[PDB]
Amino acid sequence: LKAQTKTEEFDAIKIALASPDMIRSWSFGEVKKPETINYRTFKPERDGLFCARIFGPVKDYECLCGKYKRLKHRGVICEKCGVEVTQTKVRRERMGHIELASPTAHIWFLKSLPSRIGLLLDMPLRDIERVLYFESYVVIEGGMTNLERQQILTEEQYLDALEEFGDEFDAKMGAEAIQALLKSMDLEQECEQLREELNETNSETKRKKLTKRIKLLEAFVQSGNKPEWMILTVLPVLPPDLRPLVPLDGGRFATSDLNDLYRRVINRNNRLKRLLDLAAPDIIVRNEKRMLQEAVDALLDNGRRGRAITGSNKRPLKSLADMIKGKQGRFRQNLLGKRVDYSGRSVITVGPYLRLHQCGLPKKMALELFKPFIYGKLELRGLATTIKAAKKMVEREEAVVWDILDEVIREHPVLLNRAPTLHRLGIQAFEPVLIEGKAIQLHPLVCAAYNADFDGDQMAVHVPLTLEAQLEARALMMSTNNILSPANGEPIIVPSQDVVLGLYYMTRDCVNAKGEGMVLTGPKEAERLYRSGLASLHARVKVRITEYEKDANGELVAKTSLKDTTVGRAILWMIVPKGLPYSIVNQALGKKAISKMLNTCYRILGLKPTVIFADQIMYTGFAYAARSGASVGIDDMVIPEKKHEIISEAEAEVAEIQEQFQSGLVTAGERYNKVIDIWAAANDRVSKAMMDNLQTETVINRDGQEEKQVSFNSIYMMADSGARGSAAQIRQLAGMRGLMAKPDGSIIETPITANFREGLNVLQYFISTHGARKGLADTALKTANSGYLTRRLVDVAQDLVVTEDDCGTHEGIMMTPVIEGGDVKEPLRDRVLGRVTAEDVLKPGTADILVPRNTLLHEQWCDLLEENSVDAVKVRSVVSCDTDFGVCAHCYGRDLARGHIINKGEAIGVIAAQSIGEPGTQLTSSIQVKNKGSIKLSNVKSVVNSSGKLVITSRNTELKLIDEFGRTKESYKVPYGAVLAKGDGEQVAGGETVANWDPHTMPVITEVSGFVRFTDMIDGQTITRQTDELTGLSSLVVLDSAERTAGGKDLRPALKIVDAQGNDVLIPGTDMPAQYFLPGKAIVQLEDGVQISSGDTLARIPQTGGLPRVADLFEARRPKEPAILAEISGIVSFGKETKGKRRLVITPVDGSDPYEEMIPKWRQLNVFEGERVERGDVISDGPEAPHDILRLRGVHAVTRYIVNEVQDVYRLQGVKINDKHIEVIVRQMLRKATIVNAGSSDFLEGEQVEYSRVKIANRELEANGKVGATYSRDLLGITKASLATESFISAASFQETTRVLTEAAVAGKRDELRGLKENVIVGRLIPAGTGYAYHQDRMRRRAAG
Template sequence: MSQKGIKSLTISIASPEQILSWSKGEITKPETINYKSLKPEPNGLFDESIFGPSKDYECYCGKYRKVKHKGKVCERCHVEITESIVRRERMGHIELAAPVAHIWFTKELPSPSKISLLLDITYKEVDQVVYFVNYIVLDEGNNEYDGKSIFNKKEVLDLTSPKNSIRSRNKLRRTLRNIQERIEEELNHEREALIQDFDYRLAVTYDQMLKDSNIPFSVKDVMAFIEKHTGVRFGIGAEAIHELLEKLNLEEEHEKIKQAIQNSPNAYDQKTKRLLRRLECVRWIKDSGSKPEWMVMTRIPVTPSETRPIISLDGGRFTTSDTNNFYRKIIIRNERLKQMQATDAPEILLDNEKRLLQEAVDSLFDNNSRKKPVVGKDKRPLKSLSNHLKGKQGLFRQNLLGKRVDYSGRSVIVVGPELKMYEVGIPALMILKLFRPYIISELIRKRDEFGNEIQPICANIKLAEQKILAQDDEIWPVVEKVIKQRPVILNRAPTLHRLGIQAFEPKMVDGKAIRLHPLVTTAFNADFDGDQMAVHIPLSKEAVAEARSILLASWHILGPKDGKPIITPTQDMILGIYYLTKEKFPQPIEEMILKDPVQARIEFINHFHIFATQDEAIRAYKLKTIRINDVIGITTKAFDNKSFSKEGILVTTVGKIIFNQAFPTNFPYINDVKNLYGDNQFEIIGMHESILDYLKAYNLKEPLTKKTLSTVIDYLYKVSEIEVVPQTMDKIKALGFKYSMISATSISAFDIPSYDQKYEYFKETDELVAKLREFYLDGKLTDDERYTKVVQAWSQTKDKVTHDIEKLINSDEYKDNPIVIMAKSGARGNTSNFTQLAGMRGLMSKSYNYDQKNNSGVIKDTIEIPIKHSFIEGLSVSEYFNSSFGARKGMTDTAMKTAKSGYMTRKLVDSTQAVVIKGNDCGTKEGIIVREIRNTKDNTSIESLKDRIVGRFSINPIYDTKNKLIIEGDKLITNEIANMIQNSGIREVEVRSPLHCSSLYGVCQKCFGLDLSTNKLIETGTAIGVIAAQSIGEPGTQLTMRTFHTGGVAGDTNITQGFERIKQLFDCIQPQENEKAIISQVKGTVDRIEKDSNTNGYNVVIKYNKDNFVSYPTRPNAVLRIKTGDNVVAGQKITEGSIDVNDLLKYAGIENVRHYIIKEVQKVYRMQGIEISDKYIEVIISQLTNKVTITNPGDSGLFVGETISINEFTEVAQSMLVNKKKPPSAINQVFGLDHAPSKSGSFLSAASFQDTKKILTDAAARSQKDMLIGLKENVILGNLIPAGTGLKDVEEVIAYGEEMYKKQY
């Protein structure tokens, strides 16, 4: 421990002495409390003399009360006078009358338990010995037959099962005959003497009993007899295991196993695998300093009494923690066993009692892994100590990783358009509750800020509370003052990414709802249909500074996942801006254009107004001389600070002038969407140019849409100071709302375009479907082929209808149609909605079990009869039925998807939470070679080269095709340089990547590059692991659940896509047989491709190493990716489908695996229109692929089969080479998300993810030390996380907070 908290944490097996040192006394009675006096019973489970007083500074008998006696121990009741909180930390113990094996070390399914590995006996045999079923040999004694010992040490004698007992009986009989022979020799074979000899007669009797399995006999007696004569010792129960473990020589065992592994002929058979497991286990315990016999306990600790309380219910009844029931059972059985031992009870009764004690202790530690768990009154298994750790409700996830907090509240949200970007409206009632301590402190304050005495508003706290309760007028000025002192933090569940929590300055509002700024809704993914949000208050100075400087909403302009603006206006605001920036010819010209376009152009000059200043133009609009969208001219001199490519008359509209006033004065004038901030000379009529000629050729410019506005905001962020952006956004928001109201856009059924071309298409398709049905009935088509062709036909019909409607809404006739305006501007709706409103609904999907084993290669999850009517026409009954079928499937899919996506995000965070930016440069010379990602199937670009390299560091200098230097090595590739690289025809670039960062923990700044949310070099201490996980997990819910159908055959594109594909890639799940791509295992040339008539597939023959051939048979109807004569490399696809990652690793190496996963993940997200930076996917993949398994330890001291990180392995290998020793060798591993967290090296982080019991058992066996490197481990221990401001000085954080506070407007 240090001043800053715990530095590291070690877990190990507790020795009996250690348990005693924790304990404050032994518990001997099963009683808990006295139900009359409600006081704890002495020597019971709540004894005050052991656990501490129930009431602060008051002993049990009442002799001492009050703080002044602190530290004394009462002479009468032996209770120490102290605070009652010690009852949460003081422990007791129970001395066991017989040793008991710890269930975690005896039952550890599916893997063999630690005891079974140490003693080299099977898991089942350990179980039989511990539960008094079978005996085990403790000492083989002097007992041979044919020169061999009859019994081996640690051999388990099975006398219970009819099948296996014959062998054990025969061995015992052989031993008894040996004894008979010995006695015969001693007595010279004299018959009389033998008959007289008691031991001889006994040996004969026992032999007879063992021969006839129906005769009952005492095993104990037989074994005692054998021990007396041969020295062979047998044992049963945990005592026997304890003795064997005690006598185990770990050094000898270690050498023996090592030797056996070296002599093993096959490195991959089960026997060798078990030897490796044993070696690992023996080594752990040997190196940990623990003794193996500590796995069998002679005393058990009793947890502090406050952690397992008794609670009184109404009606005088009590309820208690299940742990108390377990302890009671143990104490009762333990005391009964002690009494039996004292009265010399028969061995069989003692054994039975010991077994009961073993079971009682087992159920305390782990009730659920027993065959018959102990159940409560409601027949449900009681919660044991293991259950308190495991699962969502366990200690790790419920109490240590997620805590409930004070100073918080929640309410429904409504829109607050009048707020500034960093403000939130909090209801007055809520503020009175949340800020209560601060308001009271201000009301009773006796000195002002300068230390002068003042008259307090209230004399004491009580009066202040009464005033707050009565909502007295005097308190409101104080409340206004108090809420300015600190921001509040808002959170909307589910918090899928870091923008789900942001800080705002509070503003008091009436009503009971929280008012939220409309621009931050995208980040929170909030809408105003009843969503609720939680409010929290930062308390400490550094928390307030952090909230203001880092969490404040106005600094979150760009989304972290793609670096695009996340505060882009939406819906009404877009509509308003679209209306404001639209261009129209003056009204008379508009009417004339329809009749005589040429004359209208000439007439245009007579209605073209030119203004000298902005105010003049706006006044003309207000006086209704011109309309807001009319094309006008204004001199470039009217704009003071804006730079134009030439002087003259700028052709624009009043709307655009008003819009541009929202931007900073030095920002380029936004006039043409196609030419946002480039050369605007074509928008200006120069000094000596003819206005008439210009106007004759003039074409109206497109208005701003959601997309183009986003680009403008992006540019604004790049060129302006950070505090300018939110101010500008607020102005744009106000304009948007104002002009969407002025535009008076409405919507009615008559606005939907009329369209009836579709009936011709229907006629054609219906005829085709009927034809296909005939073919099927004649046996010319299979049902699968018919279904596929029908679905394909209707899909094509719908595509035609969609195309027609797109053409229709883009025609001049509909340019002022309100619905079209909504869709075009990006405010609401899209072409697909128009198709359904005016055209046809098309094919609907139906529920389908995708995991079923079906013989047909086609997934039939589409109803083959389409819905021909559109919504405006109305659906028929059968169409409505089919439609609701699809709609319900959509709803259930969404619900399923949310849960699955949330679980995947959790796994992603768990895998990467320890990845933090460490240091500026790790000095690596390795990087990844980046190319454009293309979809090889249809040769379309998925992600351009520019997108992949921007914001990264180059490794080597980059030259263009003419050998001219574009950028030096180790320099940042900016947007401009990335464009130059792409335009110069360079196909691939080598850049730094998190995959090759050689920092021991985390990633360095240069390997990561720019921070997408700030466009600056990423800061040290940024928790990019968590950001990467959130960026990939957050859009997970937008991915489709299943396959997209192009209506082709199953082998064509119906391979898993969408969310399931991401899961398949990250969890390293093997693709199903009909989806799996065949890959080449060698580098060579395709020699020939033969059609296989039996299987309907192909045989692809590849020639390699001059004259070696290898053949790959494909599945029926496989789509080939190669042709004869092609050169192939190892890992290249031969057929279409998904590659099995483990196969790719085996034949093509780790780099190919990494590139394949990046490409496939990007394919899934970008097909859905979701952009995610490669760097995040690389961070995840680096965590899945950064481990190696040792194949040959060399002189390193590592062992075969051990898994360590690549960076650790490199360090070990380098130090071996430096010291001229033999370095180890290893192979790369790929772990799925399910296994990556448990390989993190931190047992706290791993145990709080999954398999809690196994991870803690392993960690305890090796006395593992957790250095608390990751974030999760530190959260569990209540430290500040080693990231972000957790690494900075408190004063530095506060100073930064104050500096940023000044930037609020």
């Protein structure tokens, strides 16, 4: 079958250089005149920038002169003035051209960053411009002569060289010269010579800079382009309708600057054409050629030469490059947004009468929106004659069209959206409910997701026209279909303010009230008791309840009993459906438990029950909150009676330190700290005073004297329930508020004593001002920062989408609780749940598989793992996923707006970036065990001393508390020289002392025992004599090797352990003796001859955060003062120091070639100078560089570094983000890898891990037995990783447009789409989600027969 000719639905795209003939192909005529219109009867002047003959008729299906005006005449060209009679739309299509007089360089290819012409010719830019401007001659194909090829000459030089050899030598100047250079160039032969050269000289720089260029060259050859085309012969002109002349009111016109530019180019070109026929002198024609070049350049890209100005207007005219680039940073058409029909917006409001799936839509709005649907639906039933009649009907607002509108509104969803869209929940689909008013009514439970308040926020509505859009809105973007956060499985529909206060006031209990102690048959007569004003809401009552359980297999079991509860809780139980135990509502129900209720309800019953439950909860919440009569008075805020004393005492305290400063007892800087410390300490007292005087303050009585319980005080109910307000906020109303700080950043030592309830004098307010201002500014800035972070994150991920189903790899990461500091800063069940196992985990007793192989771990599975004591689970991750160019479902996880495992085709990268970026607006000396357990020493070498204690000889040492269950609770790090009262496998209690040491001291101890000798220690050189004046006990202080004398600077002082015989006691179990050298500024303990033992110290040596932190993390930025690591495992050594720095000589016990590095000595050391250290050990402390982690530790280590650090940032702010998303960001980060070995691709080439692996895995079989090449994983920042994209159309968006388009053009890049952004730009179905099927099918049809 014939392949094709005409236009079907196109595949991909291709970009390249254009031949002069290729340019003349698009051109339907040449524009020979600068003229535009007729100036009187405004009409295109033939052969002008605007022409009917060249481009198109001014009116649809009508000739210009007016001969053939009939729609019948089509393919006829008029005889008077040839114009084919066709729609005027073709004036937006037809191109044109201009024959240039002299060749003209294309400014994009000349002035590009690499300067394509330049590096193609291997000719410097300066020389090329020197030639183009006729400043100097350049030889071309010099042949056999005195001169080379690329060599440039001058006037006299060229004249003389011409006088010598007329022929067999050639040189020119100007654009024609560069054209000749490019045309004469033989790519093939040059390639051959470069290949011969690459193989001779062996040097890094030479062969690198050679291989790069030969790569570029052969790329240009295979491209299909040709060098000549870099110099413009023909100049294409853009369609007139894309640079319109269109008129305006008052008679004035308006046109694009492209008309001015083009007109200039045409004018100067014509003048050149005339000057050539006039045989003008060289000095003229050269000037004209330069002017032509300048004009053409100004047309293509303006601002790279002169920045030409438009007629009558100072502002520089906008060129074609500026047409493509656009503005507002990097945005090209549909990224930055665009206008959309069938849409609207308005102020938003309440409406709690609504159901979670619906929203109030104003009558007028819905009418104007669905107006096209109403038109058809009217004449469909026959209510309207024709479409016009329907228009008139809805325009007259006849009473019928309302009821006719109710039809179209019923099952047709609408899209509701807010202004700051972050996470996908920013746009949610609802079901329209006609409302009288101009305001849009929103469901309260969604107010959390939108982050929308009622203070005059506005929302926009969109109509899902096509059937597919309706079903997409209903099955995906629907409100009830997302009850959960994409960031974490926790419910986003959690009740907010009034509702939680209502349920709180319900499930609260009072000590004595109506119906206290009485019994009730059930919830019905409980509510019947309350609604009759008989029994109080909160009272202690035993009721008969029937609670169910689904504990049977797939079946509900019914049970009934007498529960001890309150009347209110019992009334509330009428709501809670089926299997949920009564214990859920038996509590006080704060904002937390009320959420876990919904959560559990979803993880037990299902979606529908959770939704209806949620609606009911909101309803009863608002109801009883209204009934509660909760208010806020001035007497609701209770100021501590003791406060006035707490001030006075504190006011006395400072005075003490005020006097000591005058008597010189304390220094100024010490005084300031003392005063600020006491004043800050007073605030805690007042604050934790008012809290006690608030929470339990109510003192009541039941059949007796007094009994006290939690207070019913309103503001406190609000703060405790979680409705609104908090401890820090109530603290400002009642107790004193803070201590402010001057703009200097330093804190003022006169804190604000008065509060909001109390008056505030002038000063205090004036001081609060800076705090306010800086607060507003800070938030306003952090908005922008969060936005930018989100942008970079979406850019780095994007096209990452679930493609395969199960890649089937056992690979993954080891999931254990974070165990930070004292106890468990995050549990195991969190980091585990929702994530399918890599391999079957086992019970403490083995040969028993509770969870087989890979199975998604849900609530029940995690509960089963919780029954058992298991502290670790291996989990498949996106970073470890073997699937190339995407992620398998069995790796990623489950979590989503639904509890089920992740679907196929969902785009995970986008929701990952969104989940990370949305919350980001909220961002800114001895071990004592807190609990009871058993001591477990991890990774430690130690020794027992003469005191019976245990001293640790290892730098890297861990202390874990493993209780009887076998789970790890406490985890700490134990420094070198620490004294343990316990050992491995011991027993301790809560608060028991285990480890002890000193921070300021780094004790150098001895494993063996014996007398202490002295070697290479000489006074005045290596050491120095100093005796204490308060005691008389001395030590000879080791003099550092910077400050030593002439020849004594070369000796390494040491303490070598000797026995009774005077021999050398060897390091246990080795041939190597034991001698411990001492560093600089290290004071000894015992002198020569004095006998010691184990544990005795030989000598004792003295000594950001927030959102930008996350930014630094994701960008993999190297810190300022990085911790140095040991590059190779071995025993460290100190060579002779040099040049203000110090050599560090590592000594491998294993092979060879002892490695030495330059470390500045000023940096305090860590590593024992005389001991071995594994690769990755800390030679010094401080922040660690991510690259160092990746290189010296590994992928699994560095990914854990990132995730743990960023989570350390977020979790500190009380923000829940599943590790998943961060892991995908990591996957995108380390995507690139630099090859080491060879046999397929190049040597040092940076290339995609997916690409490389897909190659070598193909080379492990067939091919050669294995010719496959080794590589090295590389860590790239999110912005640098985002920089790498196969699609040039996608790259033309966020990157620099010019450079991208040029580099892609010279290469002949074929953009196959396959990505999200590029498909969005070109306006077709996304290669993910709904569209994923389509693009899959086509992808299969492609590359096949």
